[PDB]
Amino acid sequence: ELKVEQNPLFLSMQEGKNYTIYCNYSTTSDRLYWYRQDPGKSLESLFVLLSNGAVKQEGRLMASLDTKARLSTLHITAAVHDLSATYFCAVGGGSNYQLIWGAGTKLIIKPNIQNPDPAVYQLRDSKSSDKSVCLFTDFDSQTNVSQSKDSDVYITDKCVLDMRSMDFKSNSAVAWSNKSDFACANAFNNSIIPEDTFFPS
Amino acid sequence: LPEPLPQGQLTAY
Amino acid sequence: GSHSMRYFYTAMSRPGRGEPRFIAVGYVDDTQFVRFDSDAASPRTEPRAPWIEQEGPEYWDRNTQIFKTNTQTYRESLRNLRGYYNQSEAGSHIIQRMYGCDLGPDGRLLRGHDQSAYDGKDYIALNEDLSSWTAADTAAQITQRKWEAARVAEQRRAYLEGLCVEWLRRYLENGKETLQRADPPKTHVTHHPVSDHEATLRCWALGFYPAEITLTWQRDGEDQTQDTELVETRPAGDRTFQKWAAVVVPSGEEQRYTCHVQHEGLPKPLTLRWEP
Amino acid sequence: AGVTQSPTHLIKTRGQQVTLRCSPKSGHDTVSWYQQALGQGPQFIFQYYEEEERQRGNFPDRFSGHQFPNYSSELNVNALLLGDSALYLCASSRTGSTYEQYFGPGTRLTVTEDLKNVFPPEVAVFEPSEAEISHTQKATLVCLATGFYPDHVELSWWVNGKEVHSGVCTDPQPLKEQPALNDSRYALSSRLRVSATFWQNPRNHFRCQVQFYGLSENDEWTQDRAKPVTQIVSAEAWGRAD
Amino acid sequence: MIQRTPKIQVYSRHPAENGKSNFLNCYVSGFHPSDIEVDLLKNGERIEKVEHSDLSFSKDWSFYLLYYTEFTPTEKDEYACRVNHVTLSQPKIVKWDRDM
Ligand SMILES: [Mg+2]
Ligand SMILES: [Mg+2]
Ligand code: NA
């Protein structure tokens, strides 16, 4: 009977921008929580909303409760990459201990790359003539990294690193294959990449 | 619902 | 309206006969819905209305724990008031407290209340603005300061504006069947001769909900306020109330007399008279 | 103290048994147990208060719980099914209080058909490219942790014996090496970006460390390969001047 | 201190009809302190099956209780309420008048 549905299931966002995620629930709320979960980590508490019109703000996050509409909203202001996680919604009703949880909203905060320098570089194992690894880096956040046609080729999704000291952020994707057929130039094929992307050698 | 206990100690008279 | 929720706490010290007893009862309007007595084998909050029974395990643990914690704090409070007043260790004292909320439009707080009494006399009250206190005397001023220091008015305000008003509508929804139906008074006038010269006229109002009522005897459309016997509105035990207004009248003059009944359940006021 | 949980992980086989421990945050007297499956919201097991099981969710008798007089709890799960693999989480709250509910770090349970499926990672680091250094005045070390099962690892970068967080990026999810099978081993990549001048100093030491949560000393092992116990697999590299 | 004496009301729930099951109430109110001894008597003997409401107070801070029992009025049976408070030198017994 008490059903909790969050939306969207995932949200793509630009750093610096403002966004709203929703939590709809079906019956009278006793408690409404907002939790944050990082990949491979546990649940961090953010908010507990107990009555109609409750609004709570902690840093870049703001949660509101509308018991008439049976809705809670989470506002993310001046989104920063660090806010990237799955945000959950849990509701308790009928003075029961059992909290019904939403399926979560995965927040992907993408950086704004000021000077995109797309390139594919080859890296060598310190240890041997392995394996070796190809690195796709420095491209704008709108570049989508796709999986390869080859099953023996491995491509990781795009990742954001922050050289905090230098106030610099970059995206990277990693490719590798045991097969000696494999080469850096062909690695990111099957992915739509810039065309000014630099291929050294 | 009665008033909930504060996170800390309850203030006396 | 207005619908309301009130909790009534009674803390009583009893030297030599044990540690202070704590009693809490909950009312929505004029209907009691919970009770807690620290004197039970294993004190547990108990349901006192049908519509409150549905609440899950958490409600009972929460209520019991609040009341059990308040018990301990009320022992402490009683020791403090004893000290403020330089009172004997032998005497028995009582702290009473009534707090709650009046339900306004849109389900928002219409009025907040929090009041305390030491041995039946006003001690400390939370003001209409919900940020300030009125201390009845110098001892209450010590309390006032403890509370101002602990930002108690803000904590209490949060509850009244939020949790209290939210939980009142809920209860009102769960028990709309009884809490939202006003039972009008069933009325009649009786006649009882007193002498050849005089007779008693009794106006009865039975089985009404809620307790607020006005019974008025009028001689020729003039209030008999001076000599009208009025009984305290009393519970019938079925959740309804009873009240009678009586007046001694000259024999044969009974028709000059009229009874006026004002009740929430009554669409228009009642004009009642003796019909032998 | 905050909410605590023990053990860190468990790797079981069907029909086995487990017990897990939770201690509430100081001041909390009631404990919640939740099961969380991959890409899922937590599901309520039970709540214990005053040593009694106050309420239960949609969980069978093989899910049994205990609460001690010091508010600490235990979750026992017997006749383990492959479906029982989850993040078992505990939350605590203070009864009649402000409604806060905090969670413990969680116990990561993996129920596998046979312990022969357990494999530790192979870690390797790969050194920055000449081109990246020359073209960007920046240097990226890549670290690969491959062939591990289960998906219980913690990758960390160590520059000069000290853990670094800045300039690092680990995949939030591993790759299935054999995306086709259910007992597939995983691959995981991580990047550490430094200025070329920092990589260029050979007195700068880089270590990528992968903590694997594998078998216990007590688990039986019968395979002609090292018992895949909980362990750290690292790969190191000195800066180069070129 | 403030010591207030209880006001007593002895009545039935429904108008009393001989031979018909009803409820006998005794409403003790206007008292202070809380300690009160209340009894319902059938022909001078205390009724054993006697229940009561929970302790609560009025706007003036004075307590009130309801002591009640299932009962069948008859023409002959006399019902009363016997109350003892600190304010009373000895118990106060009030006969139940059916017309009041
Ligand atoms: Mg009052
Ligand atoms: Mg006496
Ligand atoms: Na007495």
C42 Cβ under 8 Å from any chain D Cβ: no
CATH code for residues D1-113? 2.60.40.10
Chains with ≥3 CB–CB distances under 8 Å to B: C, D
Task: Test C62 with A95 for CB contact under 8 angstroms.
Answer: yes
Domains parsed from chain A with CATH numbers? 1-111 (2.60.40.10), 112-201 (2.60.40.10)
Task: Test B5 with D94 for CB contact under 8 angstroms.
Answer: yes
By CA distance, what is C64's nearest residue in B? Answer: B2
> In 3D, which of A70, A95, A97 has the Cα closest to residue C51?
A95
Task: For residue C235, give the nearest of E57, E60, E66 by CB distance.
Answer: E66
Q: Do domains D1-113 and D114-242 have the same CATH topology?
A: yes
Beta strands in C150-257 (DSSP E): 186-193, 198-208, 214-218, 229-230, 234-235, 241-250
Task: For residue C73, give the nearest of B1, B4, B10 by CB distance.
Answer: B10
Query: How far apart are the C-alpha atoms of D60 and D83, rounded to whole Å?
Result: 13
A54 Cβ under 8 Å from any chain C Cβ: yes
Mutation for testing the D interface, residue in B1, B3, B7, B10 having most D CBs under 10 Å: B7
User: Is the Cβ–Cβ distance between D234 and D194 less than 8 Å?
Assistant: no
This structure's resolution (Å) is: 2.8
Task: Test C58 with A50 for CB contact under 8 angstroms.
Answer: no
Cα of E84 from ligand 3 centre, angstroms: 6
User: Is the Cβ–Cβ distance between A64 and A73 less than 8 Å?
Assistant: yes
Cα of E86 from ligand 2 centre, angstroms: 4
Joined tokens for residue A82? 């660090």
> In 3D, which of A31, A19, A5, A32 has the Cα closest to residue A108?
A19
Task: Test D96 with B5 for CB contact under 8 angstroms.
Answer: yes
Q: Could you say which residues from 56 to 85 on chain C have a Cβ atom under 8 Å away from some Cβ of chain D?
A: 56-58, 61-66, 69
Q: How many CA atoms lie within 13 A of C186 on its CB side?
A: 8
By CA distance, what is A93's nearest residue in C? Answer: C56
Residue spans per domain, chain C: 1-181, 182-272
Task: Test C57 with A96 for CB contact under 8 angstroms.
Answer: yes
Q: Could you say which residues from 15 to 44 on chain E have a Cβ atom under 8 Å away from some Cβ of chain C?
A: 23, 25, 27, 29-30, 32-34
Cα of A68 from ligand 2 centre, angstroms: 55
Task: Test C25 with E56 for CB contact under 8 angstroms.
Answer: yes
Query: How far apart are the C-alpha atoms of A113 and A192, rounded to whole Å?
Result: 17
Task: Test D126 with A103 for CB contact under 8 angstroms.
Answer: no
> In 3D, which of C232, C112, C111, C103 has the Cα closest to residue C179?
C103
Q: After which residues is chain E broken (C to N over 2.5 A)?
A: none
Query: In sequence order, which residues have a C-beta less than 8 Å from that of residue C268 and are 6 or more positions away?
Result: none
User: Is the Cβ–Cβ distance between C166 and A51 less than 8 Å?
Assistant: yes
A9 Cβ under 8 Å from any chain D Cβ: no
Task: For residue E56, give the nearest of C8, C119, C120 by CB distance.
Answer: C8
User: Is the Cβ–Cβ distance between A135 and D129 less than 8 Å?
Assistant: yes
Q: Which amino acid is at E37?
A: E
Scanning the structure block, which residue is given the tokens 């969380």?
D36
- Fold for domain C1-181? 3.30.500
Joined tokens for residue E65? 């209780």
Q: How was this structure determined?
A: X-ray
Rounded to 5 degrees, φ, ψ at D199 are: -65, -35
| Highest CATH level, class, for D114-242 | mainly beta
CB atoms within 10 A of CB A177: 20
Joined tokens for residue A15? 């750093």
Query: In sequence order, which residues have a C-beta less than 8 Å from that of residue D130 and are 6 or more positions away?
Result: A200, D242
A42 Cβ under 8 Å from any chain D Cβ: yes
Partners of residue D49 in chain C, C-beta under 8 Å: 57, 61
Joined tokens for residue C149? 């220091």
> In 3D, which of D4, D106, C65, D107 has the Cα closest to residue A35?
D106
Query: How far apart are the C-alpha atoms of A74 and A23, rounded to whole Å?
Result: 8
User: Is the Cβ–Cβ distance between A102 and A36 less than 8 Å?
Assistant: no
Partners of residue C62 in chain A, C-beta under 8 Å: 95
Domains parsed from chain E with CATH numbers? 1-100 (2.60.40.10)
Q: Could you say which residues from 9 to 48 on chain D have a Cβ atom under 8 Å away from some Cβ of chain B?
A: 27
Give C106-143 as a 3 state SS string: HHCEEEEEEEEEECCEEEEEECCCCCCEEECCHHHHHH
Q: A137: helix, coil or strand?
A: strand
Q: D122: helix, coil or strand?
A: strand
A114 Cβ under 8 Å from any chain D Cβ: no
* Chain A and chain E touch, per 3+ beta carbon pairs within 8 A: no
User: Is the Cβ–Cβ distance between A83 and A60 less than 8 Å?
Assistant: yes
CB atoms within 10 A of CB A11: 17
Query: How far apart are the C-alpha atoms of D147 and D14, rounded to whole Å?
Result: 23
CB atoms within 10 A of CB C192: 12
CA distance C207 to chain E (A): 9
Q: Which amino acid is at D15?
A: G
Query: How far apart are the C-alpha atoms of A156 and A176, rounded to whole Å?
Result: 9
Strand-strand pairing, D153-159 and C258-262: unpaired
Partners of residue E25 in chain C, C-beta under 8 Å: 234-237
CA distance E56 to chain C (A): 7
Joined tokens for residue D154? 């913690």
Rounded to 5 degrees, φ, ψ at E54 are: -95, 150
Q: Looking at the structure, give the CATH architecture of the domain made up of residues C182-272.
A: Sandwich (2.60)
Query: How far apart are the C-alpha atoms of A187 and A179, rounded to whole Å?
Result: 12
